[PDB]
């Protein structure tokens, strides 16, 4: 019913590797970029 | 271009406006002034230059007879050196729409007056020179910038 099997769960093997690996590397450039943002400091001095 | 200092060498001495903030001048005392005096203005970090028709021994002399400081130990005849101040790449933005005009300004750290590489840079800085709204140069200026401006 599925001849593929044994090829399709050993590309799921290489799938999650490289998913584990990409989503991290992307989380932390997301990160870097988004730092500008996030550290940001702002103050509201009205003149007197 | 304090607020480029104040950003650009953030959290260091260069980092502060010559004139200093509005709570040291409303008290700053008479002790300090002095003291400032007494700690800064040192011969050995002191120049007298002059330039025209005079001679420089004349000068000299004069200057032996009322530049007559004493030096003792050897602090006195020491120049200090000044501790490091550390650039930082960051920006500072000033905004209120109800201004005419906005200002920026865009920098990098400098060598500083030592190296030779001083010369260069200002070399470069002349290819792209200045620009502004009187030049009578116009959209024939040598300087790309300024054309496109
Ligand atoms: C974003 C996740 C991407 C996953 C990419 C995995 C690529 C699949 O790799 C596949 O593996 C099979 C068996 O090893 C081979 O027979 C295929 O030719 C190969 O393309």
Redesign the pocket.
């Known amino acids: 019913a599925e001849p593929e099997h044994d090829?399709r769960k050993?590309?799921g093997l290489?799938?999650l590797l490289?998913?584990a690996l990409?989503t991290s590397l992307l989380y932390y450039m997301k990160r870097h970029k988004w730092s500008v943002l996030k550290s940001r400091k702002m103050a509201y001095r009205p003149p007197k | 271009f304090d607020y480029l200092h104040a950003t650009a060498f953030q959290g260091t001495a260069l980092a502060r406006t010559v004139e200093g903030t509005t709570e040291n001048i409303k008290h700053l005392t008479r002790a300090d002034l002095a003291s400032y005096i007494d700690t800064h203005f040192k011969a050995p970090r002191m120049v007298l230059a002059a330039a025209g028709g005079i001679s420089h021994k004349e000068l000299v002399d004069a200057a032996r007879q009322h530049f007559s400081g004493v030096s003792f130990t050897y602090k006195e005849d020491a120049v200090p050196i000044l501790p490091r101040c550390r650039f930082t790449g960051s920006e500072i933005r000033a905004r209120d729409d109800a201004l005419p005009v906005a200002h920026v300004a865009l920098a990098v750290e400098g060598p500083g007056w030592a190296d030779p590489d001083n010369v260069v840079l200002h070399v470069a800085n002349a290819i792209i020179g200045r620009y502004d709204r009187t030049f009578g140069g116009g959209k024939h200026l040598s300087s790309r910038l300024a054309a496109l401006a």
């Open positions: 090829q050993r590309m290489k799938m490289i998913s990409l």
